Amino acid sequence: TRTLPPGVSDERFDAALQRFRDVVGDKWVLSTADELEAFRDPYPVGAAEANLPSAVVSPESTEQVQDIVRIANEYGIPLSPVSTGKNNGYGGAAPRLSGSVIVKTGERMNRILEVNEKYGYALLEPGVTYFDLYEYLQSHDSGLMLDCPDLGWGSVVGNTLDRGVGYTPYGDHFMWQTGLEVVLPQGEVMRTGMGALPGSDAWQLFPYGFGPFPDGMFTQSNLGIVTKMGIALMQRPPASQSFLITFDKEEDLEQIVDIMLPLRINMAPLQNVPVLRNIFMDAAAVSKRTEWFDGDGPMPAEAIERMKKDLDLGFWNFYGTLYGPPPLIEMYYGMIKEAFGKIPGARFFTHEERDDRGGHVLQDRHKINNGIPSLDELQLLDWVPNGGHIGFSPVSAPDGREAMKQFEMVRNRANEYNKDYAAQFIIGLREMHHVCLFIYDTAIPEAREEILQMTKVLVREAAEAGYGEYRTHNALMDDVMATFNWGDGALLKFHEKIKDALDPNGIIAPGKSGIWSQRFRGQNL
Amino acid sequence: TRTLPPGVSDERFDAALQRFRDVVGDKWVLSTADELEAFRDPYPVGAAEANLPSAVVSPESTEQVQDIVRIANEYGIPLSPVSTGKNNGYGGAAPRLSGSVIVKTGERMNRILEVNEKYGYALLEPGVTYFDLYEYLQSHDSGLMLDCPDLGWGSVVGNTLDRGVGYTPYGDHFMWQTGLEVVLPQGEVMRTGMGALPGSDAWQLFPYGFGPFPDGMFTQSNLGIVTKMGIALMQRPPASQSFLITFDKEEDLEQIVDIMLPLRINMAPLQNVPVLRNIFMDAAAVSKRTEWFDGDGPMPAEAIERMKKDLDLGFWNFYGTLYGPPPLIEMYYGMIKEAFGKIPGARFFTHEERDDRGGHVLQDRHKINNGIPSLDELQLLDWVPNGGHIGFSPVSAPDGREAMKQFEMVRNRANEYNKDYAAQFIIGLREMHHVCLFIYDTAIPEAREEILQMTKVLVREAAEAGYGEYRTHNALMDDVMATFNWGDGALLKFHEKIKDALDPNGIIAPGKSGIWSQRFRGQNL
Ligand SMILES: *Cc1cc2c(cc1C)nc1c(=O)[nH]c(=O)nc-1n2C[C@H](O)[C@H](O)[C@H](O)COP(=O)(O)OP(=O)(O)OC[C@H]1O[C@@H](n2cnc3c(N)ncnc32)[C@H](O)[C@@H]1O
Ligand SMILES: *Cc1cc2c(cc1C)nc1c(=O)[nH]c(=O)nc-1n2C[C@H](O)[C@H](O)[C@H](O)COP(=O)(O)OP(=O)(O)OC[C@H]1O[C@@H](n2cnc3c(N)ncnc32)[C@H](O)[C@@H]1O
């Protein structure tokens, strides 16, 4: 069965494809089953096929994006914009609504438009990856550093548009975004902030401009197709030092988090975004499950102890990085050792003190925390055959008790559905993103189904407990949006009203973040 | 003539007033000319009467705000929400559209809902002033400090809603805003972020929630009436030190800014928001114009030399504050002395070194920069009889040539229209808010029209040079918004569409930020 936009005939679709090829050129429109396989979710969730694209269109310019959008409006064809389309764990490039055309802006709009050394920023097209920006900065001998997520192959822009995160002091990517250019759902182009002022040099200097401040509305959003974005870049410090603290017990989570808060809330002595990773996360980065346990079920405790002993890691492993002149690093490290050294069984290691296998994660963090992009974390996906993951990502207060409750709630469903729970707390000033990655064999229909059902349960149970997700998978966007329903779904109704006003024909990424335009509401898509 | 809402009769307005009284109480609805005098712009702009309220309603609660909004929809009555209505320099409490009813939320919705010591936040109603919050923190022996603008009588909430600024490291108020509750234009209530998740404790912990991030759309905005807002609060550091650098020559501006940028962009050694104030700003804070000059026209060079010599101040005066352990402060201050000391004629003073009349501004800044609110700056308005100001507030790159260009441009016109130009550059990481206060005799219709005409010319002339304003007066909002016209006025068209979608009846603060709903567009008020 050929994949078709909803309500659009074989004939009408064929004509639209031709219109698209007129805009972007023949090579840059894909529509055959073989070509579209590469744009399916690499880590499919649920037994049944879902999230099927009808085509991929690769524009080279904003003008072409505007014409594509105009064509889509005429035919009623949905358009799902992506940058590099590496949102793996949340759907990959795949559209929320089957039958949508992917607009893969980053294939050809991949220019670094500006890196400004004096004011420390970049103006970027969506195709710029973190590796690309890294190469630029190195080549020019920049005094700037980037902030990258765990995997460097994504888009500086794309990641920011999903409010993704890295681990330097610039880790909150949307916080550092300054200025954007967007194609709105009927094809009009708009610049935000000081970019709305012709001839301004301040587009990447002052984010707000004048009047209502809208850039946030284009994040986790279906209100347009972004074609340019600025981002502030931090100055590279003179020196840095990373460290690991291993903690022996599952139960240490509470005290680790409680001790952490006062050292983090003022951005010193914990300067970077610390990560607190469980043994499953760290073992999966350097080893296969079968090294520790052959068995269909939850890993017994003795296999867990062997993981820890062989990798010389704790159940909970805390990684951080310090920056500045060497005497500042030594003061801050001293404080960190003193505070966390109050937990029995804690041991400390700098990035100069491990050369073993279990220390590979530390060396990888030391790269990432210094703005050096890496793909070593891809090795997690070799944990089991045909490995995929999904991200269940609740927000947590920086409170040890809350963090333990979340860990216990997630652990228990993980056990019930037979899926390993790899945990990574990403610690902001006043909150943590509690990222729960579930690694599974994507070829087994039953495992894909258990992933879906387990995660649907976790979203509901976490919400009954007062926790919501910061970000989620295509498969869960409706369920997650249904949890933010204070005042009888006030927030959703507001988003629908705006959606319907800007997108009267229901073209752009319908269903993103549970937000469906009028023509799609009330349906089972 | 009685001031009446456009298109609304005496009889209908009388009916709507009684309904307002049914909601809030007779005592809480003001509608006589005498009662309304105190809600006129205290620093009026233009010779002709403008910005006339028809009434003032003071609601006790969110529910009452909802009822008021419902009434105003049924009767076609525009509503102008304020918190404390101290937006002096930009309109005071007066509505952009004459005939609107002011909803003074802050009169009775003035509760501190929560101050959380552990996570460092406050949840506030709109009537909490900076003084009120300071008093709370002092009374409870808090380890937190607030961040305040120059005058403490404003609203933590109201100031943030106009994207106002203060001077500690938390001086970007909008950056630290975390969660809000808002009554939308037809009377529905919504909570943003994690507050949309029933029972979440993270409303003031994690700003974004899930899906498109909307809070910024309620700043400089007419999309709702805000009833609660969260803000982060910084921990008080163990020590601080403030300093003043005087620079003798107007031409020193370029070099000052160019030396400043590398000391600021990393937040160290310039940790706080420095301010660079000219002699007219500082002299006006401590003296009357007639002490220095009592002739016609702009002050002569000799008179300016006298202000400087008598006050022991420069033409340009740089104020900053340093925070932390004493050895860190000393290291940072040594670095600041070394850099700025290259400018011939620069002199340095700490808050411990000057107790004279000229040093009164340094003493005030030492309070403000440590979150101690003050009203001493109100003395600026005694510079001339019936004194008032208007703020012309262009954004500048943190570049000396740019700042110098802006200063000369503004000075040329100030001189041409015989208005004294007091300057305060407010220095962010990558930008400056170049606040130009023109102080004038508000009683004289000539002076008020010259203010109006001069500022209109400056808005145009700045925009021709590629500069736009971050914030502006009622009288200038149309003109300022007209400058942000990239892409054939795309930004404004986008705002108008959202406005019409959320506010089908055109009720909330029509004209705020140049954004008029359909029923008022093209009418010229
Ligand atoms: C499997 C995995 C994933 C992962 C990770 C570790 C592992 C093992 N670590 C991450 C980390 O440390 N931090 C983080 O933010 N994410 C992490 N992930 C998830 C994922 O790898 C990355 O976030 C990746 O960077 C995201 O993919 P990409 O950068 O390629 O972004 P995209 O797929 O193009 O876009 C994502 C969504 O944003 C909207 N979007 C994107 N571009 C546009 C344009 N131009 N216009 C409008 N909307 C756009 C779409 O919603 C798109 O789906
Ligand atoms: C004359 C002057 C002004 C001044 C200053 C020094 C002098 C001599 N120094 C300032 C500074 O250091 N920083 C700063 O941000 N502003 C400074 N000003 C300007 C003014 O004093 C202050 O900003 C003052 O804090 C603002 O007044 P207030 O705080 O009372 O705020 P408001 O008048 O109530 O509200 C302003 C606008 O915001 C919108 N608003 C307010 N509340 C609501 C609600 N609840 N819902 C919807 N919108 C709201 C309106 O647009 C309102 O007009």
Short mmCIF file of N, CA, C and O and ligand atoms in Angstrom, two decimals, chain A residues 43 80-95 103-106 126 128-130 148-167 171 173 181-183 218-228 275 277 281 365 368 377-381 388-391 424 426 435 437 439 470-471 474 477 508-509 512-513, ligand 1:
data_model
loop_
_atom_site.label_atom_id
_atom_site.label_comp_id
_atom_site.label_asym_id
_atom_site.label_seq_id
_atom_site.Cartn_x
_atom_site.Cartn_y
_atom_site.Cartn_z
N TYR A 43 14.03 3.44 15.84
CA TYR A 43 13.84 2.74 17.08
C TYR A 43 12.32 2.69 17.21
O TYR A 43 11.70 3.44 18.01
N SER A 80 6.02 17.89 7.73
CA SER A 80 6.72 17.65 8.96
C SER A 80 8.20 18.11 8.85
O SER A 80 9.07 17.39 8.29
N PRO A 81 8.51 19.35 9.34
CA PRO A 81 9.88 19.86 9.24
C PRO A 81 10.84 19.19 10.19
O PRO A 81 10.49 18.92 11.34
N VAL A 82 12.05 18.93 9.73
CA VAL A 82 13.14 18.43 10.54
C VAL A 82 14.38 19.18 10.08
O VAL A 82 14.34 19.87 9.05
N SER A 83 15.42 19.14 10.90
CA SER A 83 16.69 19.74 10.59
C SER A 83 17.56 18.59 9.99
O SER A 83 17.57 18.39 8.77
N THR A 84 18.25 17.85 10.84
CA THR A 84 19.04 16.67 10.45
C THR A 84 18.21 15.41 10.68
O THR A 84 18.50 14.33 10.16
N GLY A 85 17.17 15.51 11.50
CA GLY A 85 16.28 14.37 11.68
C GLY A 85 16.89 13.25 12.49
O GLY A 85 16.62 12.08 12.20
N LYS A 86 17.71 13.56 13.50
CA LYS A 86 18.30 12.56 14.34
C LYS A 86 17.70 12.55 15.71
O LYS A 86 18.38 12.23 16.67
N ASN A 87 16.41 12.85 15.81
CA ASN A 87 15.71 12.85 17.12
C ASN A 87 15.42 11.45 17.61
O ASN A 87 14.28 11.08 18.04
N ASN A 88 16.46 10.63 17.62
CA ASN A 88 16.30 9.25 17.97
C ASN A 88 16.02 9.12 19.46
O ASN A 88 16.61 9.78 20.31
N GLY A 89 15.09 8.24 19.80
CA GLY A 89 14.58 8.10 21.17
C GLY A 89 13.21 8.77 21.29
O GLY A 89 12.44 8.43 22.23
N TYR A 90 12.92 9.68 20.34
CA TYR A 90 11.68 10.43 20.24
C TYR A 90 10.95 10.35 18.90
O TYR A 90 9.92 11.04 18.68
N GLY A 91 11.47 9.49 17.99
CA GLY A 91 10.87 9.28 16.66
C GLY A 91 11.78 9.35 15.44
O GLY A 91 11.34 8.99 14.33
N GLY A 92 12.99 9.87 15.61
CA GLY A 92 13.92 9.95 14.51
C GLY A 92 13.45 11.06 13.60
O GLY A 92 13.10 12.11 14.10
N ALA A 93 13.44 10.85 12.27
CA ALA A 93 12.87 11.84 11.38
C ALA A 93 11.38 11.65 11.16
O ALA A 93 10.79 12.40 10.40
N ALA A 94 10.79 10.62 11.72
CA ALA A 94 9.48 10.19 11.31
C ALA A 94 8.43 11.15 11.78
O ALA A 94 8.51 11.62 12.91
N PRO A 95 7.42 11.42 10.91
CA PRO A 95 6.33 12.33 11.25
C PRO A 95 5.34 11.77 12.28
O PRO A 95 5.03 10.56 12.31
N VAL A 103 10.00 17.68 5.47
CA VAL A 103 10.76 18.78 4.90
C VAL A 103 12.09 18.73 5.64
O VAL A 103 12.16 19.11 6.80
N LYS A 104 13.13 18.20 4.97
CA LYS A 104 14.40 17.95 5.62
C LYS A 104 15.24 19.16 5.29
O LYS A 104 15.97 19.23 4.25
N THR A 105 15.10 20.18 6.16
CA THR A 105 15.68 21.46 5.83
C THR A 105 17.22 21.33 5.81
O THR A 105 17.92 22.08 5.13
N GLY A 106 17.76 20.46 6.63
CA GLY A 106 19.19 20.47 6.86
C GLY A 106 20.08 19.81 5.80
O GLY A 106 21.30 20.09 5.75
N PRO A 126 19.73 25.06 9.53
CA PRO A 126 19.42 23.89 10.33
C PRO A 126 20.31 22.67 10.10
O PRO A 126 20.38 21.76 10.94
N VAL A 128 23.53 22.57 10.04
CA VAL A 128 24.75 22.57 10.78
C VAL A 128 24.68 21.59 11.95
O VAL A 128 23.97 21.81 12.92
N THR A 129 25.52 20.55 11.89
CA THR A 129 25.65 19.64 13.02
C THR A 129 26.67 20.17 14.04
O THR A 129 27.49 21.09 13.77
N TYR A 130 26.67 19.56 15.20
CA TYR A 130 27.66 19.91 16.20
C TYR A 130 29.10 19.60 15.71
O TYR A 130 29.98 20.38 15.97
N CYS A 148 27.27 20.72 23.27
CA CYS A 148 26.67 19.62 22.52
C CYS A 148 25.96 18.63 23.44
O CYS A 148 26.33 18.41 24.56
N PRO A 149 24.93 17.98 22.94
CA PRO A 149 24.35 16.84 23.57
C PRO A 149 25.30 15.60 23.51
O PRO A 149 26.44 15.73 23.04
N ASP A 150 24.86 14.46 24.01
CA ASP A 150 25.68 13.24 24.03
C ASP A 150 26.17 12.76 22.65
O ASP A 150 27.28 12.19 22.60
N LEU A 151 25.39 13.01 21.57
CA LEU A 151 25.64 12.62 20.19
C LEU A 151 25.78 13.85 19.32
O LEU A 151 24.88 14.68 19.27
N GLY A 152 26.92 13.98 18.66
CA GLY A 152 27.30 15.20 17.88
C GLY A 152 26.72 15.33 16.49
O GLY A 152 26.99 16.32 15.80
N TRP A 153 26.01 14.29 16.04
CA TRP A 153 25.53 14.22 14.69
C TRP A 153 24.21 14.96 14.49
O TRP A 153 23.76 15.15 13.38
N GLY A 154 23.60 15.40 15.57
CA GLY A 154 22.44 16.25 15.47
C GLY A 154 22.74 17.68 15.07
O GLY A 154 23.89 18.08 14.85
N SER A 155 21.66 18.46 15.10
CA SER A 155 21.60 19.81 14.57
C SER A 155 21.65 20.77 15.72
O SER A 155 20.92 20.59 16.67
N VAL A 156 22.50 21.79 15.64
CA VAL A 156 22.50 22.81 16.69
C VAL A 156 21.05 23.38 16.82
O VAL A 156 20.50 23.50 17.90
N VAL A 157 20.45 23.67 15.68
CA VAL A 157 19.11 24.23 15.57
C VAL A 157 18.02 23.25 15.96
O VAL A 157 17.15 23.53 16.77
N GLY A 158 18.08 22.06 15.35
CA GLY A 158 17.10 21.04 15.58
C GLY A 158 16.94 20.66 17.00
O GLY A 158 15.79 20.57 17.53
N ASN A 159 18.08 20.43 17.65
CA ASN A 159 18.05 20.11 19.05
C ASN A 159 17.42 21.27 19.92
O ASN A 159 16.61 21.04 20.84
N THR A 160 17.80 22.50 19.59
CA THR A 160 17.30 23.67 20.30
C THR A 160 15.79 23.76 20.10
O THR A 160 15.06 24.05 21.03
N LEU A 161 15.31 23.47 18.88
CA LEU A 161 13.86 23.50 18.63
C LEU A 161 13.03 22.46 19.39
O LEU A 161 11.82 22.63 19.54
N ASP A 162 13.66 21.41 19.85
CA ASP A 162 13.01 20.48 20.79
C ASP A 162 13.34 20.71 22.26
O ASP A 162 12.84 19.90 23.12
N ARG A 163 14.03 21.82 22.58
CA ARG A 163 14.50 22.19 23.91
C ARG A 163 15.33 21.10 24.51
O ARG A 163 15.25 20.79 25.72
N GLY A 164 16.24 20.63 23.67
CA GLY A 164 17.25 19.67 24.06
C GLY A 164 18.35 20.33 24.85
O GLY A 164 18.38 21.55 24.98
N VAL A 165 19.28 19.52 25.36
CA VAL A 165 20.19 19.97 26.43
C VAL A 165 21.59 19.44 26.22
O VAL A 165 21.78 18.39 25.63
N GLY A 166 22.57 20.21 26.60
CA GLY A 166 23.92 19.75 26.77
C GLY A 166 24.44 20.01 28.17
O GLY A 166 23.68 20.15 29.13
N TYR A 167 25.75 20.03 28.29
CA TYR A 167 26.37 19.81 29.61
C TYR A 167 27.42 20.80 30.03
O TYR A 167 27.91 20.70 31.15
N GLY A 171 24.46 24.74 28.74
CA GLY A 171 23.67 23.53 28.51
C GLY A 171 22.22 23.66 28.17
O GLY A 171 21.65 22.74 27.56
N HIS A 173 19.96 24.85 25.93
CA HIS A 173 20.11 25.40 24.57
C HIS A 173 19.11 26.46 24.22
O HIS A 173 19.46 27.47 23.61
N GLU A 181 14.57 32.89 12.17
CA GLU A 181 13.78 33.13 10.98
C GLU A 181 12.91 31.90 10.75
O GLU A 181 13.38 30.75 10.89
N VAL A 182 11.62 32.14 10.53
CA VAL A 182 10.67 31.07 10.42
C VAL A 182 9.70 31.35 9.26
O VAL A 182 9.25 32.49 9.03
N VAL A 183 9.39 30.26 8.55
CA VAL A 183 8.27 30.21 7.58
C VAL A 183 7.02 29.75 8.28
O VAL A 183 6.97 28.62 8.81
N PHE A 218 7.96 28.61 18.88
CA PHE A 218 8.49 27.78 17.81
C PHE A 218 9.31 26.64 18.29
O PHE A 218 9.96 25.99 17.47
N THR A 219 9.22 26.34 19.57
CA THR A 219 9.94 25.19 20.15
C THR A 219 8.91 24.13 20.64
O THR A 219 7.88 24.49 21.12
N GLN A 220 9.22 22.85 20.45
CA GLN A 220 8.30 21.74 20.62
C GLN A 220 6.92 22.05 19.98
O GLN A 220 5.86 21.84 20.56
N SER A 221 6.99 22.56 18.75
CA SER A 221 5.92 23.26 18.14
C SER A 221 5.61 22.96 16.72
O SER A 221 6.49 22.64 16.02
N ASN A 222 4.40 23.22 16.27
CA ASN A 222 4.05 23.09 14.85
C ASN A 222 3.58 24.38 14.20
O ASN A 222 2.75 24.36 13.30
N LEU A 223 4.16 25.49 14.59
CA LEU A 223 3.73 26.82 14.10
C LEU A 223 4.55 27.33 12.95
O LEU A 223 4.26 28.41 12.42
N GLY A 224 5.52 26.57 12.52
CA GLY A 224 6.29 26.96 11.33
C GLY A 224 7.49 26.14 11.09
O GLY A 224 7.77 25.16 11.82
N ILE A 225 8.20 26.51 10.03
CA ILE A 225 9.40 25.83 9.63
C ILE A 225 10.54 26.80 9.78
O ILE A 225 10.63 27.83 9.08
N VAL A 226 11.44 26.49 10.72
CA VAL A 226 12.53 27.38 11.01
C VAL A 226 13.68 27.18 10.01
O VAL A 226 14.00 26.05 9.70
N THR A 227 14.23 28.26 9.51
CA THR A 227 15.22 28.28 8.44
C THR A 227 16.55 28.92 8.86
O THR A 227 17.54 28.76 8.16
N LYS A 228 16.55 29.71 9.95
CA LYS A 228 17.77 30.30 10.50
C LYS A 228 17.58 30.44 12.02
O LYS A 228 16.47 30.73 12.44
N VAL A 275 25.86 15.11 35.59
CA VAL A 275 25.00 14.02 35.22
C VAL A 275 25.19 12.93 36.28
O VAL A 275 26.30 12.72 36.76
N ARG A 277 24.37 9.03 36.52
CA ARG A 277 24.08 7.92 35.64
C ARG A 277 24.14 6.65 36.46
O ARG A 277 25.00 6.52 37.35
N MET A 281 23.29 2.49 32.55
CA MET A 281 23.65 3.45 31.52
C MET A 281 25.13 3.29 31.19
O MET A 281 25.50 3.29 30.05
N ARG A 365 32.56 11.97 28.80
CA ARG A 365 32.00 13.19 29.43
C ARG A 365 32.97 14.41 29.34
O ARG A 365 32.53 15.51 29.11
N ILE A 368 32.52 15.90 26.03
CA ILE A 368 31.23 16.54 25.82
C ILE A 368 31.13 17.86 26.65
O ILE A 368 30.67 18.89 26.17
N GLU A 377 28.69 7.30 22.64
CA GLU A 377 27.41 6.82 23.24
C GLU A 377 26.51 5.98 22.30
O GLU A 377 25.65 5.27 22.79
N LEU A 378 26.71 6.05 20.98
CA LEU A 378 26.08 5.06 20.07
C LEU A 378 26.27 3.61 20.55
O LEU A 378 25.37 2.76 20.33
N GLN A 379 27.33 3.35 21.29
CA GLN A 379 27.62 2.01 21.75
C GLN A 379 26.56 1.47 22.69
O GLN A 379 26.38 0.25 22.76
N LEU A 380 25.84 2.34 23.41
CA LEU A 380 24.61 1.90 24.12
C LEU A 380 23.69 1.03 23.28
O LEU A 380 23.02 0.22 23.82
N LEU A 381 23.54 1.33 22.00
CA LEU A 381 22.57 0.58 21.19
C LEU A 381 23.05 -0.89 20.85
O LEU A 381 22.32 -1.64 20.28
N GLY A 388 17.43 -0.52 20.07
CA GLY A 388 16.85 0.84 19.98
C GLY A 388 16.63 1.35 21.39
O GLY A 388 16.82 0.63 22.36
N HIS A 389 16.31 2.61 21.52
CA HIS A 389 15.80 3.12 22.81
C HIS A 389 14.65 4.11 22.60
O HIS A 389 14.49 4.66 21.51
N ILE A 390 13.90 4.30 23.68
CA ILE A 390 12.91 5.39 23.81
C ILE A 390 13.24 6.17 25.07
O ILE A 390 13.73 5.60 26.07
N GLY A 391 12.99 7.49 25.02
CA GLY A 391 13.28 8.35 26.17
C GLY A 391 11.99 8.68 26.88
O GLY A 391 11.07 9.27 26.26
N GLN A 424 19.70 8.66 33.52
CA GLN A 424 20.65 9.80 33.51
C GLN A 424 19.87 11.02 34.00
O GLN A 424 19.03 11.53 33.26
N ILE A 426 20.02 14.89 34.56
CA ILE A 426 20.71 16.03 33.99
C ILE A 426 20.30 17.22 34.88
O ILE A 426 19.14 17.63 34.86
N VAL A 435 16.16 11.44 32.74
CA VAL A 435 16.03 10.81 31.44
C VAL A 435 16.16 9.29 31.64
O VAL A 435 17.13 8.83 32.21
N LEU A 437 16.17 5.90 29.69
CA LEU A 437 16.30 5.28 28.38
C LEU A 437 16.03 3.79 28.51
O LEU A 437 16.57 3.14 29.36
N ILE A 439 16.30 0.32 26.55
CA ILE A 439 17.05 -0.25 25.44
C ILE A 439 16.37 -1.59 25.09
O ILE A 439 16.00 -2.31 25.96
N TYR A 470 9.35 16.49 30.04
CA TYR A 470 9.85 17.71 29.39
C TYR A 470 9.83 17.59 27.87
O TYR A 470 9.92 18.62 27.13
N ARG A 471 9.78 16.35 27.40
CA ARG A 471 10.02 16.02 25.99
C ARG A 471 9.59 14.58 25.82
O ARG A 471 9.76 13.78 26.76
N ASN A 474 6.98 10.66 19.55
CA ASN A 474 5.75 10.69 18.70
C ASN A 474 4.57 9.91 19.25
O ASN A 474 3.46 10.37 19.23
N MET A 477 3.01 11.67 22.43
CA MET A 477 2.78 13.14 22.53
C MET A 477 1.35 13.46 23.00
O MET A 477 1.18 14.33 23.83
N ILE A 508 1.06 22.24 9.02
CA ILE A 508 2.37 22.01 9.59
C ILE A 508 2.33 20.98 10.75
O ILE A 508 1.56 21.12 11.73
N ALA A 509 3.17 19.94 10.62
CA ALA A 509 3.36 18.85 11.63
C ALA A 509 2.21 18.57 12.55
O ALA A 509 2.32 18.67 13.80
N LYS A 512 2.11 17.37 16.59
CA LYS A 512 3.30 17.68 17.42
C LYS A 512 2.85 18.21 18.79
O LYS A 512 2.00 19.12 18.88
N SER A 513 3.32 17.55 19.84
CA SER A 513 3.10 17.96 21.21
C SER A 513 1.59 17.82 21.55
O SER A 513 1.09 18.50 22.47
C1 LIG C 1 19.27 7.67 21.39
C2 LIG C 1 19.93 8.89 22.15
C3 LIG C 1 19.36 10.17 22.02
C4 LIG C 1 19.79 11.29 22.72
C5 LIG C 1 21.01 11.14 23.57
C6 LIG C 1 21.63 9.89 23.74
C7 LIG C 1 21.11 8.76 23.07
C8 LIG C 1 21.82 7.43 23.18
N1 LIG C 1 21.46 12.24 24.24
C9 LIG C 1 20.88 13.44 24.16
C10 LIG C 1 21.42 14.59 24.91
O1 LIG C 1 22.45 14.47 25.66
N2 LIG C 1 20.71 15.71 24.82
C11 LIG C 1 19.65 15.89 24.01
O2 LIG C 1 19.08 17.00 23.88
N3 LIG C 1 19.10 14.87 23.27
C12 LIG C 1 19.68 13.64 23.33
N4 LIG C 1 19.17 12.59 22.58
C13 LIG C 1 18.00 12.85 21.71
C14 LIG C 1 18.59 13.24 20.27
O3 LIG C 1 19.77 12.47 19.87
C15 LIG C 1 19.20 14.65 20.11
O4 LIG C 1 18.41 15.63 20.81
C16 LIG C 1 19.39 15.14 18.65
O5 LIG C 1 20.28 16.24 18.71
C17 LIG C 1 18.07 15.62 18.06
O6 LIG C 1 18.02 15.42 16.70
P1 LIG C 1 18.35 16.60 15.68
O7 LIG C 1 19.39 17.44 16.29
O8 LIG C 1 18.67 15.90 14.36
O9 LIG C 1 16.95 17.39 15.54
P2 LIG C 1 15.75 17.05 14.43
O10 LIG C 1 15.38 15.60 14.47
O11 LIG C 1 16.16 17.72 13.09
O12 LIG C 1 14.57 17.93 15.04
C18 LIG C 1 13.91 17.57 16.26
C19 LIG C 1 12.52 18.21 16.20
O13 LIG C 1 12.51 19.62 16.23
C20 LIG C 1 11.52 20.15 15.32
N5 LIG C 1 12.26 20.79 14.26
C21 LIG C 1 13.52 20.52 13.89
N6 LIG C 1 13.96 21.34 12.90
C22 LIG C 1 12.92 22.15 12.65
C23 LIG C 1 12.65 23.25 11.72
N7 LIG C 1 13.61 23.66 10.88
N8 LIG C 1 11.44 23.84 11.76
C24 LIG C 1 10.47 23.41 12.61
N9 LIG C 1 10.65 22.42 13.49
C25 LIG C 1 11.81 21.77 13.52
C26 LIG C 1 10.73 18.95 14.88
O14 LIG C 1 9.79 18.69 15.92
C27 LIG C 1 11.73 17.84 14.93
O15 LIG C 1 11.12 16.54 15.16
#
